[PDB]
Design a protein around this nucleic acid. Sequence first.
DNA 1: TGAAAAGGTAAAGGAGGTCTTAAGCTCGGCTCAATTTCTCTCTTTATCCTGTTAGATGGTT
Length: 236
Amino acid sequence: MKPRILVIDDDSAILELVAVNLEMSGYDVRKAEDGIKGQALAVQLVPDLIMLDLMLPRVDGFTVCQRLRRDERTAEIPVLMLTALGQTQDKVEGFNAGADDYLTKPFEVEEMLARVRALLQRTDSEILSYGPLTLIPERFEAIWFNRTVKLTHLEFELLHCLLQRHGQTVAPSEILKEVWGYDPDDDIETIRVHIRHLRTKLEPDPRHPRYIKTVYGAGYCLELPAETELHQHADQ
DNA sequence: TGAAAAGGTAAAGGAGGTCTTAAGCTCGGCTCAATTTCTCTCTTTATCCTGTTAGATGGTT
C-alpha cells in the first residue's frame, strides 16, 4: 500500500507545501489544522508517519505527542516534530515528549523528505472525527464545529454509534444492542428520549432538526455536511 | 378524509454517584539517650630463618 502520512499544522501554508511535496513523493497525505483534530485523525487512521507542528491551538504539540504515546494504538507511530526552535525550554520539554525527531522551520524540502524516508525505513479503528464533529471520548465531550458540548455517557455513546454509521439509517434495535446491549425486543422508546437531547444540544432548531434526521419507520440518521460546506453552517 | 402507527416532549420518580461532617485512630517527625562501625594507633603475636662443637658412621619387620 501507499504509506499514510498525517501532517498536523495550523499554518495552512506550511501544511499545503508539505502536503504537495509528500504527494509528489507518492504518499497518501492527510491534513489536520489543530491538535484535537490531529489527535482524532491519528487514532482513527493509524498513519504511517506523524508530522507534528509545535504551536497548535487549544492543545500544545507536546500534550498531543504525549497523548499519542499514551495510546497503545499510536504509541509506536513515529513523530517528526515541526518546531519554531528558539528557546532551550521548549527544547527541554520536547526532550520528554517522546518525539522521534525535530525539524526547525524554515526547513529545506529535501531535508524533510530525508527525515520522512529515514523514519519510514525505521518503522519497517473507530471514526472519531468527521466534518463538524470531533468526539472527545476521554472527556465525554463533543466538539461541534467550534463549540464544546458536554454529553452524558449514554448520550455520548449514542452519538458515537450514530457517527459510526454516518449517512446511513440506524435501526433502534441496533442501537439497543450496541449501546445498551439489550434485546432487540426491549422498549425502544427510551432511545427516542435521549435522541432529542442530542438534538437539543446539537441542532440550531430542535423542532426542525437538520443533522439528526428521523427516517420514519427506520430510525435515526446523522447526516453531516462535508468539510467543504462548513463555512455555510457555522453562522447557524 | 379518516385513521392507523410511529415519534416526540414534558414530567415524577427513582437510581446512582458524588459530596459533607463527628469519632476515632495511627503515623511520622522531633528530640535525645543510647548506643554499634570505623579508623587511626599500638601492640603482640604468627611465621620463618640461621646456628649447635666430646664422640658417634649399613634396617625391622
